[PDB]
Every structure is written in structure tokens, then in C-alpha cells.
Amino acid sequence: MVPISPIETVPVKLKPGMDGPKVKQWPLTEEKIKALVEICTEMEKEGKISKIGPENPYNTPVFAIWRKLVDFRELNKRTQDFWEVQLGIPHPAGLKKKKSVTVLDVGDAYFSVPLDEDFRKYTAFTIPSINNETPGIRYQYNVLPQGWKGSPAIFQSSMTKILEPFAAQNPDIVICQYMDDLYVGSDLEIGQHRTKIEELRQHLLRWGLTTPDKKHQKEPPFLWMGYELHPDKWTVQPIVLPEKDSWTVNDIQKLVGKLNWASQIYPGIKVRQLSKLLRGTKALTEVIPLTEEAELELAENREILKEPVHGVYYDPSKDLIAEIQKQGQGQWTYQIYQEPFKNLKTGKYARMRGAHTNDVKQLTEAVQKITTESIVIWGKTPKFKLPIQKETWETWWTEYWQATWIPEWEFVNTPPLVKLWYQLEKEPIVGAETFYVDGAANRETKLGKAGYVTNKGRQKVVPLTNTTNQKTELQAIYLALQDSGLEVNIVTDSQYALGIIQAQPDKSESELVNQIIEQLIKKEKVYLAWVPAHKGIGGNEQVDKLV
Amino acid sequence: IETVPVKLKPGMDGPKVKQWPLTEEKIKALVEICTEMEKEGKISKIGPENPYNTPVFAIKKKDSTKWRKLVDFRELNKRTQDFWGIPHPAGLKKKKSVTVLDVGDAYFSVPLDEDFRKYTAFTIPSINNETPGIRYQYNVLPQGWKGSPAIFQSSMTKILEPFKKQNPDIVIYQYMDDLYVGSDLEIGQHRTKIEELRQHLLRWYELHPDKWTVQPIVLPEKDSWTVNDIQKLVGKLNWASQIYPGIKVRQLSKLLRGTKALTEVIPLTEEAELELAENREILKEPVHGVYYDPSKDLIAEIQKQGQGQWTYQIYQEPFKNLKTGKYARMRGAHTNDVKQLTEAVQKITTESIVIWGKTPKFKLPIQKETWETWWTEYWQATWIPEWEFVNTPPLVKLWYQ
Ligand SMILES: Cc1c(Oc2ccccc2OCCn2ccc(=O)[nH]c2=O)cc(Cl)c2ccc(C#N)cc12
């Protein structure tokens, strides 16, 4: 017998202060008992488990469904934390095209790796005897159990350690490692490739790891994790959108998830109108109707999901390009490609939850997202094609109070173009009328007044019902904008209004703010000055709106 | 050669911080560096029984193309037990010139406590999750860890003992992987003395604190004042009255009586000139009751003034500034706001280290996502301060300009 190489065990401990699991074994039928006896007998013969004495005080429940099922949940609660690296999965758009590609699934993955002997006594379980008239048959694991917390991490590290020298000795191939699977790829001739695969599974066999001996059980196209991997292209598995005249919150969540999944290769997917209905969640049972916006959006989604679209694979020798389009209502869509009309992948971005916003900020955020995603998938930042003029971005970042930056990018003229809708003056305007504005409200009656006095003698005060100080302060400015010429100086003591306007929004959740914006857009020059309130500053008439 | 037992704080488990994505060149750099370090026993590969993780990335220091490895030990630092204390040299900030040296390599000689090594675990990530990350843990004292200078304090003392005995006029301070050397010599003599000290450290950044002081609140001096000028002046004085007790604005506000055009010139009354004068005299004096409390955090606020100009204030209690300044240095960041901000944060942190011997918590005028995306690309320091993000434009911007 050729001595199979030994796999060094991983030292495992329990969580501090805890002890091994001790759970009462469930009563099983005579049939189930016989089945488990046969199975565990065979396993014991194979060396996966071993009989133990009555000394072992720990026990884990076992069931039969024949296939056995050891419920390690309590042990999983008592087992230490392990380093999971499985967070994130390989994205098809990141894969570099190879002439030949092989998939190997290891058989008896966990049962091929030895368990730390000092930990084996915590994996003990008992098979109930017939009529329970004899002491139940006692067993413990000698290898990694299916369903245990530490099994994936240990198996993964073991596989990595085993694979390292082969990979080092074969730089002309690439090996991707994912759970119980290995994915090898090379640009070699098919014969050399099959040869190297045979060498690989031989090398794995040296450590006692079994691979498909026949023609490998999986050949292209590969269906994996919702993806379809083809020799020259990739896509997603076909979409399934349920149709019912009565939608629940859970169905909304599933639909949203599926649309999101479809959006990574299908361009133009929108999910806003359907996501707005997820307000007041945690109630999975409900009947929520659909608006015309939502219905048209979903119909348009079916329209896009009508015909199949494929993404290509990554080529490191060509540049990486990301192009962005504005879709409206805080929605953005983007394509990542290298050759025209051949997307590596697609995606979308939705604006955050805010009271005020503008297009430039949203485009910026979208750029950050695409940048991070691209660094994950391809390990580099793509060159950007943005629907914004160079001079627009220039003016923005040069005059913006916050620091901001966009990586290398160029202007692409595909409307609607992101633009700056208004620009406040930095100095007072000569020859322009000066509106001193003010507003005030009563906290109890919610009655207020908003208005202005100007240097030409123009005056106005409007009485308001159901309002606040902030609302009247905005309203005054709005009045001044309404009644002034194309150029106007405005004086306010409202740090609130000044804050809002200095944040530079182009759209708002407040109708009043939006109207103010609409006024600002129509203006040629606006200078907005601030003064302290109640400081006896003439012009600033707090007493005119407090009557 | 003898390991000193190091533990964590009572009731605190090791750091478990997600590694953020890295570009391919940084990954390759870290692969080479960590391979070489592994061949030197400085680090060792670890199994999955180690659940702890600390982020890691790659940078490029000043005047060097060589990639350097930086570990973000912030979480481990705050989870690492308090090491005890050497009183901060209050004369370091008073010295004419100070030079900063990198004594990080010296840490790689001293071995780290075995039982503590599992807490310094880090991961080199792979692109597109194609393979699991390469995991390491430190065997020697890691750079960036707060325990490293504390442990090496005795050694550093024994090493610098002859030099300190030689020049009693030269102040030597240490923070993290850096050694601050202050004196009053000449730049040439300074550089030669630095070569002397570095070759003294071999066989075993010109910074001038004097050219940096605290900044006063100034008021405009005009022959003619517009309504706008007086309004801004009144705003600034009202603001400053939160800091200075005797500031009054009634005689200046008295001038604004009536609804006048903003550009209209208003002559100052004698009472107004008097009031303005008294306000100047008041502002010329230092702030009342401003003390430093080593038990409290230092807070640093930064404002973007535009055209490469940035202002900053370090305080503990609002309106009680311990330091103020204006970084306007242009160094290959003309088109990049984030690079400028990053360099500003580094300089302010450095000054903070020189003055108080600890780092301030920053309030950055930048969106979290932007900063988080780009700040590592321009970072050149071995330490990393704490920060938070201000999303509302502060009115006090032009009052520091
Ligand atoms: C099969 C294959 C891979 O293959 C590759 C393995 C190593 C290096 C490069 C690879 O692919 C580059 C792109 N590509 C892809 C498929 C193909 O047929 N041809 C081709 O060129 C890579 C991955 Cl993540 C896979 C993940 C899951 C499954 C399954 N089931 C199979 C995979």
C-alpha cells in the first residue's frame, strides 16, 4: 500500500467558560434505528467514526431521514469562532478567459480530513437501541462532521495547504478554490490541459482526495450560484417573476431581490417604485396595491427581461471602462465594459435617504460604488464616462465647501446631462435691490408671518396658518425671490435656510424648498447674506413679522 | 531577546476587523513584502483556528518608490491594555527645529509574546475572491502597535543614553514608530547631527515648531465701510463674543439702522470707531481660562477655504481652542481635494503629536464614502488617527478666513 500523506490537524477549542454539549437522545422508530445501525457500522468500517466507552459524558442528537443527520446546533453554539474567508464569491465578469477549463468536485470532502483528537470527544452521539432495553450504541467522530461549524474553514485551509506547491510548480495554469470545488483554467492546448488536470488529481490523490475519475461530471455550460458560465461568455440563470393579483410584503422582497440579481447583466433595471412599498416592514402578511408608476416600471422590467443578454470575460490587456447614465428619481444605471457594446457587467445605484440632494453628489456616490466594486472584481479602478461637462464638475468641486474627488474620467454627451442649476454670488451685487427678509411663527397657535422690506421701499408681509419658524424663514426668502428682479441681494438671519441653500440642492422633499430652487434657477444673480438676529440690525425687521 | 507577557483589557476579545479591497499592485506589493518577512521569521502563516483580523494595506513614503506595508492597528490599539508613564516633553514644541526619524525596523529584533501573537492576525486579500486570503500573524513587535514602543522603551533608552549624555540641549521624544529630535542648531549642523544620530542607531523631514504659533482673530481695517462690510463685521464680532467676554456690537449695529443697499458706503460714527477699537484690544488678548486636560480627547476641525487653502482648530471644549492654524501648502495636489485634506490631517496630527503626545479626533468636511474610498492612496504616516464626518456646511468658515 502506498502511504497517503498525513493531513496535520487543526487545534480546536470550545468557547471560554463553556463545556461540551449534553443533549438527550430522541426516541426513534425501530426501522430508523436499524438504518442508523447499518450506516454507522459502514462508517466505522471506513474509519470515519469509532465506538467509545461509557466514560464520555457528552452527547449529540441523531436523526434518520436512509440517511443519518446529526444535529450539531448546540455544539455549534459551544464551538469557537473560525475565520471564514467565504465572504463574497467569485464574480463571472472578473474571470479571465482561458482556452481550456476544468471543474473538479472533491468527493467525501469533510470525511477526508482528520479532526483534532482532543476535540473528538465533544462530537459524541448515541444510537437508541431496540425498545431501549440495552445501552445505546456510543460513537464519536474521527473526521470533520457534516454540519459542524469548523468543517468548512478547516477543510478549506487544508485544501489550500495541499494545493500550494502544485500551483507554485505550475504558473502556466490558474486554480480557483471554492468550497468542495476547484476550477482550473489555462491557455494551453487541450491535451496539455487534460494532462495537467490528471497530474493535479494525482497530486490530490497523494493526500487521499478523490476527484471525478470519469469524464468530469460537469461540462459547459456551468450552472453555478444563479449564473450561467459559457466558454466565451457569461449570463444569469433565467428569471422567474411571479404574477399574482394579491401581493404580500415577502413577495415584494423576493421580487426586488430577483430584479436586483437580474440588474448585474441586464441594463436599465429599476426597483424604486416597488421598494417604496417596503415601508412598514416586518409584517410579511399584507396586501399592497400597485401604482401606475410601479406597474409601468415592472412592465418595463419584463420588457428588458424579454430577450437574453450575455456578459463577456475580462481581458487584462485592454482598458476597463465604466459608463454612467441618469435615469431619474434618484436612479442611476451603469455599464462596465472594455470593447463597445460588449459589457463585462452592468449595475445600478439609488440615492440615499435624504431631505435634500443634487445630481452631482449622487453621481459622485455612484462613482464611489462602481470604483469599490471594480476594485473587488478586477483589482483596479475603471476609466469613467460621465454625463457631466468638465467645466461643470470644475465649478462644482472648486466652489463646494466639502472636499470631493472623481478618478480619471471623460465627458460623454448622452442626456440628461448632470448640471449645476444655480450659482450664488460671492460678493454683493451692485445695482441690485436689497431684500431684508424675516419670518416668525407662534409655537402654540402655529400662526406665523413671513416677508421682506427693501432699500427701494418695497415691502410685504404675508400671514400664514399652520407653520413653524423654519417654514416662515424659508417662506420669506421665497417671497423675496418671487417679487425681485433677475438680480437680487437677500439678507436673512436664518442659519437654517442658509444651511439648506449652502448645501446646494437641486431637488428636495419640502415643496417650499423646491419652489425656492425653481426661483433660483430663473435668476441671473443671487447674493445671499447672513446677519445675527435680534442685534438691532436695521432693515432686519423681526418686529414686522411678530405682530 | 526575552519576551514580556502582554494581555488585553478585561472583558475584551481580540480585534475582528474586515479587510477592505485592495488594488492589484498593492496586493502584489504586500505579497512580496510578507513573503520576505516570512523568510525572516518576522511573520508566520496561521490556520483557521485564528478568528481575529486587522486590516492591512500598502503605501509609499516620501522620496521612495519602494512599497511599504501599513497595518491599521487602531482597533487592536484600543483593545490593547494600557501600558505604563513618561511625561510628555513640553519643550519639544518650544525647540527651534525638530526632525522625525523612522525607527520601525528596530522593532523587528524584539520577539513578541507568544500568547498574544494570535491578536495581530492580518489577511492579504485576493482579487475577485478567487482564492482564500493569505493569513499571517506577527512573531516580533509589529509596527503600528502601541505596545511596541512601550516594550522597546528600555532598549531605546539604553541605545540613546550616550547621545543624550552627550547633548543635554537636544530633546528626544518617541511616538509609535517615529523618533522626534528637537534642538536649536543650524540646518546644516542639524542635518549632520541627524546623520550622526542615524548612524548611531545604525551600528546598534525638516519641521520648525518656532515658525508655527497660535492665530488671533483679526478685524478689517478700512477707510470706507459698506453695509455688507459692517454686516459681516457684526456677524464675526457676534461669533467671537462666544469666545471673548467683552465684545459688544450695539454701536456698529446702530449704523445699519434703515433698509440700505448692501453696496452703499456708510461712514462710521465716533462711538462705532470706539467700539471697534475696544473689540480689537479685546481680541489682542489671549483667551480666558484655556487649559489642556490629558484625560480628555483632542478634537480637530478642518475647513476647506478653497484655492488649496485649509484652516483648522484643535480644542477640547468648544470655543476653547488649544491650537489654530492654516495649511496652504501646495504639493502636487492642485487638482485633488482629497489628497490635500489627507496631507492636512497628517500635518495636523503630527503637530498634535509634537505638542501633546497624542492624536486628535478629526471632523472632516467630506462625505464618508469619498474619504473611505480614497484616503489610503495619499497616506504616508505610520500612525492613523480617528475621524468622523460633518455633513452640514458650518457658517464659521469665513470667520477663520
Ligand atoms: C469553470 C469555472 C471557472 O473557470 C476558470 C478557472 C480558473 C481560471 C479561469 C477560469 O475561467 C475564465 C472564464 N471562463 C469561464 C468558464 C469557461 O468555460 N471558460 C472561461 O474561459 C471559474 C469559476 Cl470562478 C467557476 C465557478 C463555478 C463553476 C461551476 N460550476 C465553474 C467555474
Swiss-Prot record, chain B:
Site (Essential for RT p66/p51 heterodimerization): 374, 387
Impact after mutating residue 206 to A: Complete loss of RNA-dependent DNA polymerase activity. Complete loss of RNA 5'-end and 3'-end cleavages
Protein name, per record: p51 RT
Effect of residue 205 to A: Complete loss of RNA-dependent DNA polymerase activity. Complete loss of RNA 5'-end and 3'-end cleavages
Effect of residue 208 to A: Complete loss of RNA-dependent DNA polymerase activity. Complete loss of RNA 5'-end and 3'-end cleavages
Phenotype for residue 70 to V: No loss of polymerase activity. No loss of RNase H activity
Shown part of the complete sequence: 604 to 1027 of 1447
Record annotation: effect of changing residue 371 to L: No effect on RT p66/p51 heterodimerization
Effect caused by changing residue 179 to V: 22% loss of DNA-directed DNA polymerase activity. No loss of RNA-directed DNA polymerase activity
Outcome of swapping residue 175 to F: 70% loss of polymerase activity. No loss of polymerase activity
Chain positions of motif Tryptophan repeat motif: 371-387
Organism for this UniProt entry: Human immunodeficiency virus type 1 group M subtype B (isolate BH10) (HIV-1)
Outcome (variant: residue 177 to N): Strongly decreased RNA-directed and DNA-directed DNA polymerase activities. No effect on RNase H activity
Effect of residue 145 to A: 73% loss of DNA-directed DNA polymerase activity. 70% loss of RNA-directed DNA polymerase activity
Annotated consequence of substituting residue 178 to A: Strongly decreased RNA-directed and DNA-directed DNA polymerase activities. Loss of pyrophosphorolysis (reverse of the polymerase reaction). No effect on RNase H activity
Annotated effect of mutating residue 178 to E: Drastically reduced incorporation of phosphorothioate nucleotide. Loss of pyrophosphorolysis (reverse of the polymerase reaction). No effect on RNase H activity
Effect listed in the UniProt record for changing residue 148 to G: Complete loss of polymerase activity. No loss of RNase H activity
Domain of life: Viruses
Effect of residue 383 to L: No effect on RT p66/p51 heterodimerization
